[PDB]
């Protein structure tokens, strides 16, 4: 394990995020080659092509250990950004930022993931570094700071102008795989435009630190280390995104890029510590820092089949150390696990290690009940990294497969997505064959339907998403009585029940309470729970619009029975009908899912954000300023949040991001309740 | 992937092994080799772990069963061994026979399950094939006959010597998943040791059949088919256990073992026919053969939740064939069921099938009142595959939430009919009834791992009962409460006697009223009142059983007498008559069966007698001793831990209800004192 670094400052866990056909595969291939041929030159103690096969590949660049993670490019990407400490964003110079990159960039923005940009395909016709860097501002609202400029356009691409050390690194002519660059003076053709972007970089660098601002403004020139260190601080704080260029296919620009990963991307020490919750006690927060002294905690993010080893579990260790053959707890499942062989996968070999320490990524063998997203931890000090509890779905969509083969494909999609997403719920009515999926939002459901149709090729009719409304009562209704007297064939059925129905808060979140005040055996004790079950069964339905009834307290006050005719079945009918009777007379109301929306926007677009939120019946809660940006917190009904992603992006020209969580159910306004009821009665 | 109708080409088997022995890695390799090799610089997932997985090896259908989780829960292990036709025993070459693998071996011995042995981890340092085969004889009393010999030791492990075909199958270098072997001649280093074990195998084969004994002794050499056929006969009869070796992690030896399952493990035709009983007629025996022509019979052995399909019931069909959308009867419950979609689960898909035929294992959909252990059968020829089990719980535990925040537990889940939930009303006081102390502990883990409740668990309490021993006559009670609005009146005179009943019934009500002295309108109310009072005790608050109430006389007021007043009268008169009929407390007596290693048997009988046990039999099965005894459940508390320490973890115990017996005098006073202490 001497090959695994314990100095986490010299470790970098990063991945490549890019649009498809942008060059992620070819860039990773070139990274792995250049890093191999430059490793232990004259220090090895003592044709070839690199393909990427492992989900995580470990390599070394200039005395730093680089753990590269294959980002799919969904819930899987959200997990990978937690496994990532930083990312390299690869763009196609012909197109700049593309619709796919927008989504991942905003998720990395949510989790404050430092990024550096590599504009690829600079050899191709139509590729432009300057146009592409514009699209980063226009569509991502990103402070993209070019740290280099291209030397040449289309076929004449030869290298890059280094804007930190003012020199040019050129690969002239047909460049061999792994061939180094020639360091030359900046060409005269580029001298002024280089000086313009040098000023832009120096101004950003000088404004970060007061000591350099006094130094820069005084006419003194900033040192390379001061410039380099300032860019790193800003990049790690997600303040700026350094931009590079090259041609991975033409073998131009890879080596400066690798330097940028070392120079400006964060180590396990630079990112904030891992925050999780105790196994139980979700509210209790547990924090695990990136040091071997802390208790062991690790997240499993990929399950794979190795051509030699069989089933392989990839894990990201955030804190502490564990050894091979030692027991750990799968905190997500509460089951014990024993770590088998431990590996760090290299480009062309499998490096076995004897223990799994903090800040590193490993492939584990002997795991039996660990799934992607599960947390492995010290048995004595247990942490769960992902939240285990989720509220019931608030939006539902209906899917009906077209053919009997689409039904079988839908059953293999609901199985693989269950493994990846525990947040979504599925139920199937075998009559009509209507699979209804519950989700956490319209976009969450929109993702699942797409993955069913593109990654699993289902052909089905998708319904329009329906908000999961509920019903409750606002008033106390007293001495509501119902009598069931059905004379079925032969012997009849009898049950009389008198209940008292009131709203019920639930101190700890309870939705229902049943109380029996029956005195003197007027209702036999054996029949009391049948009234409860009958009331609860009738609660499944609704008195107003057919939506479930919640926050009710049923008080069984009295009743009557015939010794022969009364049965558990009869007292369940009585409970059912009496609940429908009392709820109708107790001011029934409809409840709406309310969302806790938080929007981070620049000041200039903040007014346009609050105006949009007000139009969605939102209630503004806060107007904070965090990290030079303004954060608006508001409660918005989920019913009004349809299409927020596109509307926010249009109104704020792409510079604002948002997070939606469930908050509570609230009574629907009067004018909106009648619209809900009218639609439901017609459905 | 079609469904085979030639049941000779079918293998219903499972893997039994100690923990960390390689069950998961061997199952992984089986599923890969059977898929890619027969009917890579890669990485992928199918994320499927089915209770029963159907796969194919060389034109034979292999149905693999997941071995039960709770090894000490004897109801789960016996069910799976009934679903199994044969088993593959996986051992660690470094450790040989281990305590948990010993327990299942003796259980498989009880149920006559043919077994083959696979010595795994032969590439690990300290692994010895011959040491493991010695432990098979010393600790399992098993005629373990090696049909293979290891080629290499520890890191130099390369393959196996086949002792039937007398060749060597070697996997040289780093073996990829599914990589084939090279069949080579036995190395000279192993030629002598191979011939020694070849003679041992030939002698076992030759003594089986007289014809082969003539050929072997005559100097003629036995054919491969003759050796294979003899080993198969001996393996199916549990006379010999073939021994193999390999490395599941290093991908060496998997294909020979799959061959051994086909060659020497039993088919559905080779196992004895299914033996059951007619509903509610334990003495009447019904036999179902492994043929589609016989009436349909199937056992449900696993209930699971499918993400898309909902409830999934895994069934092992022993006899006949039934189609989708056809009705069957759940003989265990007496209710009818309609088979919905039928599935055979594969390593990477769900294969829909049109019928559930004999000798195969399926996943069923549309079942509502079928539980693990229930028997599905043709309505006309009703069979129950599992023996009758006591319904009422014998052990009770109290669970109280928190230390309302943890009322999340609804647990209306069918669970089993074995669990009964009743309320003593102390903070709700969910009291759960079970078949034993381990039974409840299994359920509590479900409530705490699958539902993560925070609760105080009580100490297990024996579910005692009460009864009467003498006849009491002319017991009268008069209910006269003059309430303001309306008064109430009811007089009843009853006769109370003990009543076992030819039908096994707990209660009998007879009315000998002569005139309309008690109106016919209120007779059923008196019966209900007596039954209500029987739920509670007269001595220590435990339910009363085996009572007969005879209503002899009474009185009524035309206005004041109601059904309620006579229910109070019937109730109070039973509490009064039972007190005067010599009430006694009854305790559940259990049929305990302990399978113990050779050495520790003596401590078992002494312990059982110290727990007020009555020894009934000792038998010798294989190399172990089986002690059967009748022991009161009250004295069996903590037996698992005491036996496991006493037998170094190598022994098995079974507890099933047997009968109720009167509690001894000094123990009756202890029970009563606690209850009166409330
Ligand atoms: N001319 C040119 N072609 C490139 C470059 N990078 C990638 N390509 C080509 O683009 C195609 C897709 O690139 P690929 O690595 O598969 O992108 P990915 O799908 O995002 O992983 C491949 O055929 C490459 O040959 C580049 O820098 N210049
Ligand atoms: N070296 C070696 N290790 C093995 C072999 N078979 C299993 N293992 C390892 O033993 C550990 C436990 O095996 P496992 O399949 O989980 O056994 P189980 O607990 O009974 O299911 C795992 O980490 C396996 O990788 C083998 O043939 N050789």
Numbering used by the authors:
A (entry chain A): 3 to 48, 61 to 87, 92 to 701
B (entry chain B): 4 to 42, 58 to 421, 427 to 701
Give me lines lifted from the publication on this model.
Elongation factor G (EF-G) is a highly conserved and essential GTPase protein that catalyzes tRNA translocation on ribosomes at several stages of protein synthesis.
The crystals of Mtb EF-G1 diffracted the X-ray to 3 Å. The GDP molecule is bound in the G domain. The Walker A motif (23DAGKTT28) forms the A-loop (P-loop), which mainly binds the α- and β-phosphates through main chain atoms in the same way as it does in other EF-G proteins. The O3B, O2B, and O1B atoms of the β-phosphate are specifically recognized by the backbone NH groups of T27, K26, and D23 through multiple hydrogen bonds. Two interesting parts (switch I and switch II) of the Mtb EF-G1 G domain in molecule A are missing as a result of structural disorder. However, we could model switch II of Mtb EF-G1 in molecule B following refinement. The switch I region of Mtb EF-G1, essential for coupling GTP hydrolysis, was found to be disordered, which is consistent with previous study indicating that the switch I region of EF-G1 has not been modeled, except those in the EF-G in GTP form bound to a ratcheted ribosome and in the S.aureus EF-G structure.
